[PDB]
Amino acid sequence: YGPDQRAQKKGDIILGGLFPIHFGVAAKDQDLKSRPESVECIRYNFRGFRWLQAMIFAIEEINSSPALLPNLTLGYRIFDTCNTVSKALEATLSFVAQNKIPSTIAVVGATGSGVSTAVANLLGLFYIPQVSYASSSRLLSNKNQFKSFLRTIPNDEHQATAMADIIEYFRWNWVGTIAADDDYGRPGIEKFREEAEERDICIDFSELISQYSDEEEIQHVVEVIQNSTAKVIVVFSSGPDLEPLIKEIVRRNITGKIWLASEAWASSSLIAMPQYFHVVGGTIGFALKAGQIPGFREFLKKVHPRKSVHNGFAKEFWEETFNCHPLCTGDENINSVETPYIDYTHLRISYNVYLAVYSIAHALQDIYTCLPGRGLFTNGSCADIKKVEAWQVLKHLRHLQFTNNMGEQVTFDECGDLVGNYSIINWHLSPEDGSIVFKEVGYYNVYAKKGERLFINEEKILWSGFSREVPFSNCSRDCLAGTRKGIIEGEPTCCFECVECPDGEYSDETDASACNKCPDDFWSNENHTSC
Amino acid sequence: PDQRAQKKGDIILGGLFPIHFGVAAKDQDLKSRPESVECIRYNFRGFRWLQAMIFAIEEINSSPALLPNLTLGYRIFDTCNTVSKALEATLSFVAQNKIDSPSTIAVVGATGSGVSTAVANLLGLFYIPQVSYASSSRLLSNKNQFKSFLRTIPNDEHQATAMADIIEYFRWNWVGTIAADDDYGRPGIEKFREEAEERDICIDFSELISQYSDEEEIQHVVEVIQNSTAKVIVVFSSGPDLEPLIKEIVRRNITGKIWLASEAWASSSLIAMPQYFHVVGGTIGFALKAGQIPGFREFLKKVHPRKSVHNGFAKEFWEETFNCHLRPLCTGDENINSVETPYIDYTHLRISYNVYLAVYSIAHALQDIYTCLPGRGLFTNGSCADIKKVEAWQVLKHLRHLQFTNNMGEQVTFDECGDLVGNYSIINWHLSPEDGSIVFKEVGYYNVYAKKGERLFINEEKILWSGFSREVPFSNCSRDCLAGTRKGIIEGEPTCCFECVECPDGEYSDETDASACNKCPDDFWSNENHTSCIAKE
Ligand SMILES: N[C@@H](Cc1c[nH]c2ccccc12)C(=O)O
Ligand SMILES: N[C@@H](Cc1c[nH]c2ccccc12)C(=O)O
Ligand SMILES: *[C@@H]1O[C@H](CO)[C@@H](O)[C@H](O)[C@H]1NC(C)=O
Ligand SMILES: *[C@@H]1O[C@H](CO)[C@@H](O)[C@H](O)[C@H]1NC(C)=O
Ligand SMILES: *[C@@H]1O[C@H](CO)[C@@H](O)[C@H](O)[C@H]1NC(C)=O
Ligand SMILES: *[C@@H]1O[C@H](CO)[C@@H](O)[C@H](O)[C@H]1NC(C)=O
Ligand SMILES: *[C@@H]1O[C@H](CO)[C@@H](O)[C@H](O)[C@H]1NC(C)=O
Ligand SMILES: [Ca+2]
Ligand SMILES: [Ca+2]
Ligand SMILES: [Ca+2]
Ligand SMILES: [Ca+2]
Ligand SMILES: [Ca+2]
Ligand SMILES: [Ca+2]
Ligand SMILES: [Ca+2]
Ligand SMILES: [Ca+2]
Numbered sequence A: 001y002g003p004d005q006r007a008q009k010k011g012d013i014i015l016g017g018l019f020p021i022h023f024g025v026a027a028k029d030q031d032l033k034s035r036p037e038s039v040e041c042i043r044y045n046f047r048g049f050r051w052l053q054a055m056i057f058a059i060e061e062i063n064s065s066p067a068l069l070p071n072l073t074l075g076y077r078i079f080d081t082c083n084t085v086s087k088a089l090e091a092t093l094s095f096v097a098q099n100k101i102p103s104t105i106a107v108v109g110a111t112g113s114g115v116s117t118a119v120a121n122l123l124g125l126f127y128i129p130q131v132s133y134a135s136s137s138r139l140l141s142n143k144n145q146f147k148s149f150l151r152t153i154p155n156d157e158h159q160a161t162a163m164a165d166i167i168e169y170f171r172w173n174w175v176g177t178i179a180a181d182d183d184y185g186r187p188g189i190e191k192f193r194e195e196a197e198e199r200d201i202c203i204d205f206s207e208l209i210s211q212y213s214d215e216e217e218i219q220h221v222v223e224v225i226q227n228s229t230a231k232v233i234v235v236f237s238s239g240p241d242l243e244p245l246i247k248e249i250v251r252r253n254i255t256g257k258i259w260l261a262s263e264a265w266a267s268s269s270l271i272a273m274p275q276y277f278h279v280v281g282g283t284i285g286f287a288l289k290a291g292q293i294p295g296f297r298e299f300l301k302k303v304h305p306r307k308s309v310h311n312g313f314a315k316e317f318w319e320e321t322f323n324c325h326p327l328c329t330g331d332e333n334i335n336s337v338e339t340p341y342i343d344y345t346h347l348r349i350s351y352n353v354y355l356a357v358y359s360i361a362h363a364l365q366d367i368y369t370c371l372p373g374r375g376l377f378t379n380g381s382c383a384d385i386k387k388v389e390a391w392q393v394l395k396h397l398r399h400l401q402f403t404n405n406m407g408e409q410v411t412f413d414e415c416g417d418l419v420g421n422y423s424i425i426n427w428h429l430s431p432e433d434g435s436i437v438f439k440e441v442g443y444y445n446v447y448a449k450k451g452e453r454l455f456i457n458e459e460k461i462l463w464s465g466f467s468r469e470v471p472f473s474n475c476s477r478d479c480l481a482g483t484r485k486g487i488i489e490g491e492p493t494c495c496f497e498c499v500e501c502p503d504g505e506y507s508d509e510t511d512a513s514a515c516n517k518c519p520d521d522f523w524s525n526e527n528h529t530s531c
Numbered sequence B: 001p002d003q004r005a006q007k008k009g010d011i012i013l014g015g016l017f018p019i020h021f022g023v024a025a026k027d028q029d030l031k032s033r034p035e036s037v038e039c040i041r042y043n044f045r046g047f048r049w050l051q052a053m054i055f056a057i058e059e060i061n062s063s064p065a066l067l068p069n070l071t072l073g074y075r076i077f078d079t080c081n082t083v084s085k086a087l088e089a090t091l092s093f094v095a096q097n098k099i100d101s102p103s104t105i106a107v108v109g110a111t112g113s114g115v116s117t118a119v120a121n122l123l124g125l126f127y128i129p130q131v132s133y134a135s136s137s138r139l140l141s142n143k144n145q146f147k148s149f150l151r152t153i154p155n156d157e158h159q160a161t162a163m164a165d166i167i168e169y170f171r172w173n174w175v176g177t178i179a180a181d182d183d184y185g186r187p188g189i190e191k192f193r194e195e196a197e198e199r200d201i202c203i204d205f206s207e208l209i210s211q212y213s214d215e216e217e218i219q220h221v222v223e224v225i226q227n228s229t230a231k232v233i234v235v236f237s238s239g240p241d242l243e244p245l246i247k248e249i250v251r252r253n254i255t256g257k258i259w260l261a262s263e264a265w266a267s268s269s270l271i272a273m274p275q276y277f278h279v280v281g282g283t284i285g286f287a288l289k290a291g292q293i294p295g296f297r298e299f300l301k302k303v304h305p306r307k308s309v310h311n312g313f314a315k316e317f318w319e320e321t322f323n324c325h326l327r328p329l330c331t332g333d334e335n336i337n338s339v340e341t342p343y344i345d346y347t348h349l350r351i352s353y354n355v356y357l358a359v360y361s362i363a364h365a366l367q368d369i370y371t372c373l374p375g376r377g378l379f380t381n382g383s384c385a386d387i388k389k390v391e392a393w394q395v396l397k398h399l400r401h402l403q404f405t406n407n408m409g410e411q412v413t414f415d416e417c418g419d420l421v422g423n424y425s426i427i428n429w430h431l432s433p434e435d436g437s438i439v440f441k442e443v444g445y446y447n448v449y450a451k452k453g454e455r456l457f458i459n460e461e462k463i464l465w466s467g468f469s470r471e472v473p474f475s476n477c478s479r480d481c482l483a484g485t486r487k488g489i490i491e492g493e494p495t496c497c498f499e500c501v502e503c504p505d506g507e508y509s510d511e512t513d514a515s516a517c518n519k520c521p522d523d524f525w526s527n528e529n530h531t532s533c534i535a536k537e
Helices: A045-065 A085-095 A113-125 A157-169 A184-198 A215-227 A241-252 A275-279 A295-303 A313-319 A349-368 A390-398 B044-062 B084-095 B111-125 B157-169 B186-200 B217-224 B239-251 B274-280 B298-299 B314-321 B351-370 B392-400
Strands: A006-009 A011-017 A074-080 A102-106 A130-132 A149-151 A174-180 A204-208 A231-238 A260-261 A282-289 A399-403 A409-410 A422-429 A436-444 A455-458 A484-487 A496-500 B006-007 B013-019 B070-077 B104-108 B130-132 B149-151 B174-182 B202-209 B231-237 B258-263 B284-287 B403-405 B411-413 B424-431 B438-446 B456-458 B485-489 B498-502 B523-528 B534-537
Touching: A006 A260, A011 A045, A011 B217, A045 A074, A045 A295, A045 A313, A045 A349, A045 B534, A074 A085, A074 A113, A085 A102, A085 A113, A085 B111, A102 A390, A113 A130, A113 A149, A113 B084, A113 B111, A130 A349, A130 B424, A149 B157, A149 B217, A157 A231, A157 A282, A157 A422, A157 A455, A174 A184, A174 A241, A174 A313, A184 A204, A204 A215, A204 A241, A215 A241, A231 A275, A241 A275, A275 A422, A282 A436, A295 A422, A295 B149, A295 B239, A313 B130, A349 A390, A349 A399, A349 B258, A399 B013, A436 B231, B006 B044, B006 B314, B013 B044, B013 B084, B013 B351, B044 B070, B044 B217, B044 B298, B044 B314, B070 B084, B084 B104, B084 B111, B104 B351, B111 B130, B111 B149, B111 B485, B130 B351, B157 B231, B157 B258, B157 B284, B157 B424, B157 B438, B157 B456, B174 B186, B174 B217, B174 B239, B186 B202, B202 B217, B202 B239, B217 B239, B274 B438, B284 B438, B351 B392, B351 B411
Parallel strands: A011 A074, A011 A102, A102 A130, A130 A149, A174 A204, A174 A231, A231 A260, A260 A282, B013 B070, B013 B104, B104 B130, B130 B149, B174 B202, B174 B231, B231 B258, B258 B284
Antiparallel strands: A006 A074, A282 A422, A399 A409, A422 A436, A436 A455, A484 A496, B006 B070, B284 B424, B403 B411, B424 B438, B438 B456, B485 B498, B523 B534
């Protein structure tokens, strides 16, 4: 059978699903004293449950549309990954059960690049297409490695360049970098490192973090941050991988810092806590272009613990949202409790889930509506939808082109990626609410020419959550007239000494490389300003 | 899989080896149902490592000292240096366990860190211990991720520091970096990057490569190398991942470069080719601690396709050695000594020794299973493991707490991260005068047990730079500032890149590579060359 907690529904064609319904697994690192029992998943993820719902909603919406996959039913087998490779693989082994009892023709998921890579290695083997709604690592664009992998989220390459463009914009040359020690944080900071050095930005420190980092490991990173004159900190990490570090920085009230948030934690409920505002206030981050899902918000509200014969996560959702089953009536209202399930402004990753399901639906439709000699298969033959195999769906998904329910053109490139713009958000505090509000202060247009991609409105930004002045984050303060830039041995190029000009020489303008000799008739003034 | 090395036993040890260097590099049309991909370049060294697992298993079996009561059986598969082929095989090892959604109690392998990580994710799930003889990535030290992973090869962390120590030694400040775009090359160069920056070494370029890189992808890297003033190139890659790049550099006869070889390619048959010597000559690389396995070289010669019934790779080995079929045909009367392949053409057993050591680690862990009596145990209430009903997780707790004495009388133990420390030998790529083949001369050593700064030993006299010159090459961004001049900033370029600005009148510079010029005392004035001061002004 496979895992106990699941969202299952029978159909003619089955779509697998992988969602982080829980943030992690139990802190039980067994001594292996006895036979190891299955680990239990711990922190409930309401946002993750909302994404699971977007898959079901889309599946039901397709099932109701008679012209899309006519006289056919889309079924599903959705599992909880708990943001862990092991739990995800347990589930993936169930999807591939038949391949070496209904077949899984395609899989939606996973979230974390580390989890999606592990799933892709196993699915790729059986040519089952995988459509991830959130895994953005550049490593997943390698089609020699990931033969059946596609995604409805852009690759992080431009996001890391956008970081370096923002730094170049506000004219900062002294930054620090923090990355989650996974297939997401590591390639993201590496691309950023490359782009910052192109734009002559010096990186003072480059540290690694994880959700399972020691008190010792966290201490070292906090010390590195404190012992650094760099105020700009670039962070390529997820919420769970960053939470241990942020908790400690909040505890020590380290307030100077101006955080540059990667898309994974820029909208994380684990970091966007009002208690952390003294530390995380005025964070500049990335958000994906938001999409529209009409009727979805209504569908979310219809969730009932008893009703969901199909959704086995509906009981646990009810229990966590109402500190329930104390006991539940079942007649409880979901508008009353404030959880990220309904407490959202824009559907971004949820939209990517919706878009992922529709990509598979449209790929299956192209097989179905195929005309004798216009097929993608041998001699121009068409596949039989009644006898459809996963590899056939993959062939179609590879260079799929379809029109969005918003009327927009959706296409996957040669690396199975979607290209998308980014919205730039700033972490403000709502005066009335008291909660962290994500104000859209700019955008990053990836279609624009290099140097014309970034748009920022400085006026909408609240530095450190309060300040209205762009902070200083250069290694050394600029050399004034009468002085020249001097090298500091062991320190990088944008760390300089301001050496006073020698007698007979002058420094007319600010940040001079050397002083100019006065013409033979004249001599330097009292402080070498000019002669 | 069809092609395997199987033998029944009481306890089965899984095996993963790169019998082939890669798979048919082709985009599946997907016009037709995808068939099993074809593995392509035969790996004789890989086959010799597979043999070290069988030899060790047979040596344990014959010997009464170890498990006289039990027979060690095996199920060995070819990975073809690919995640997919390795996972196909791993799915077979876990076949019995998988039913919850013939037991394999432990697995030997794989080689590539990318392959071992994929295998580890699947094995770790079922707590089947995995002992890799060659996967050296630091990423595999993470015990939250890799619960059942252990290795008989050290972690690359000190190897990358050793690179930076060698560069610091020869006083070079301008280098380039090349890494295989995998879980091996990437963390190795990243650690090197940290260490080089701590020793004030500037990296001009940082490029990525792969065995499946485009003609365009390779061309970009060769252009980057050519357009760079850096002569020292640090390469963290395997032979297969580096071969496409080296082939092109040889084709363009780019000879200036001085290569710093990662342990994976420092002894690679694919790179250590005599037609590449103009390019790869005088390469400074790393080799692990060697080992001798008595009777192994005679065991290697005993291979026949009809006789070796258990080894299904013998047929293909035979065919690729004598260039025959089982285009001319093979005779069961062919002699092994006649054909010269890397199977017998080896000098030291290093990775082969790690395979031998990996099998013995599992053997000694199982041996500690019988010797157990209630009280001497680690389980339940001091409980022990029933060697007749042994489960893989039981072998794993024993392997974690494993301490045993080696074939060379050395203590073998695993870290809390399943690692084992080891020193490195530093080799140099020389040419045999008579033979014309690439000889690996041991020019130094790296002692990991020594204090920081005292770990490296090198004999410059034994090194032949570029394969010929005895002069340590220049590889700094800018030539040193002589007396009379001071160091000046270059706005775009890093700190290693400086201008040598002439001292002003009334000032001088006593020393080479000065930050600023010193003012002469009032009685004196600047020298003709600004190197000192002369009296009367
Ligand atoms: N992009 C991240 C994961 C991620 C992106 N956005 C998110 C929002 C919430 C949770 C996780 C994410 C990765 O591929 O690893
Ligand atoms: N250490 C490399 C593989 C490797 C080391 N030595 C080798 C010799 C031959 C072939 C491969 C190797 C890795 O972890 O990926
Ligand atoms: C439509 O579906 C029903 C139920 O699955 C089936 O009985 C009928 O034969 C199908 N029609 C076609 C055209 O296949
Ligand atoms: C910081 O450095 C950049 C580049 O050197 C420069 O343009 C900027 O003006 C400096 N910052 C200040 C404080 O002026
Ligand atoms: C944190 O520091 C800031 C500035 O020093 C200050 O405004 C704030 O009140 C401090 N927080 C606490 C815990 O008082
Ligand atoms: C990206 O933004 C630009 C301008 O803001 C727009 O022209 C483009 O349509 C947007 N992205 C997409 C999905 O095309
Ligand atoms: C090169 O490298 C360092 C500077 O970082 C220095 O010790 C050495 O003397 C330099 N000079 C030359 C010409 O090698
Ligand atoms: Ca329908
Ligand atoms: Ca997930
Ligand atoms: Ca620069
Ligand atoms: Ca979150
Ligand atoms: Ca330095
Ligand atoms: Ca025996
Ligand atoms: Ca291998
Ligand atoms: Ca090799």
